[PDB]
Amino acid sequence: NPLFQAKPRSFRVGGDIQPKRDLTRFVRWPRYI
């Protein structure tokens, strides 16, 4: 509407570039933990 108009992004496969998400479970951790 104003010069500020919305610009969508599609994260379904084969689409725009995936964003940063919480990978905590999938992290590589040193032996000890």
Place this chain on the structure above:
RNA sequence: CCAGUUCUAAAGUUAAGGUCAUUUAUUGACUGAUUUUUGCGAAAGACAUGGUUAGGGGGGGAGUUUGUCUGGGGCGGAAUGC
């Protein structure tokens, strides 16, 4: 259930936008990009694998042996024991 990327040797990153505050600045906070989960993912699973024993197999490889007499030695024969 299907699709939100199939004519096209391109472009696709420090983002938009919404909601709420401050502050009037790409400032702050949520959302934009759902949730839960004391297995990154998959394949086998007490099987395989490893350990020690037991029976096979093994000139690939090690070691060694392969009598004596003897008209040279060998082939033959024993005048090798009686």
